[PDB]
Design a binder for this molecule. Structure first.
Ligand SMILES: CNc1cc2c(cc1[N+](=O)[O-])n(C)c(=O)n2C
Length: 123
């Protein structure tokens, strides 16, 4: 149906916007601390602590499968990256502090993204 095609176009447009957002967020992580899943070789007990691991590569895979239906779902995964890190690592660590900085700098990007999704009507 034409309605189905229209819905699919909207999702493709949302995916394009979220791709730009993801690239911008990842730019705020120049150390690439959040680029890949936390290694279970370097951190053997990680899954005893963190029940829902997340990272930018995993988000990008979901993104390109058009697996984010709205901005909220995308933000939930971004928040997991940050929140997991601030639980596993102590305040004095380079890991915790990277998550704080990514959260702060990312908030700016996500604030305008919400405005764009609403205004253009992508969900
Ligand atoms: C980039 N590498 C990395 C990233 C981590 C991490 C451990 C490593 N590691 O290599 O051992 N932990 C515990 C963590 O929370 N993050 C975000």
């Amino acid at each position: 149906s034409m309605e189905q095609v229209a819905m699919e176009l909207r999702l493709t447009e949302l995916t394009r916007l979220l791709r730009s957002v993801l690239d911008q967020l990842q730019d705020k992580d120049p150390a690439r601390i959040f680029a890949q899943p936390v290694s279970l070789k370097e951190v053997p007990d990680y899954l005893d602590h963190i029940k829902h691991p997340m990272d930018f590569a995993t988000m990008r895979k979901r993104l390109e499968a058009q697996g984010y239906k709205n901005l909220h779902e995308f933000e939930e995964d971004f928040d997991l990256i940050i929140d997991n890190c601030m639980k596993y690592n102590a305040r004095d660590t380079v890991f915790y502090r990277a998550a704080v900085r990514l959260r702060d700098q990312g908030g700016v990007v996500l604030r305008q993204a919400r405005r764009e999704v609403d205004s253009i009507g992508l969900e």
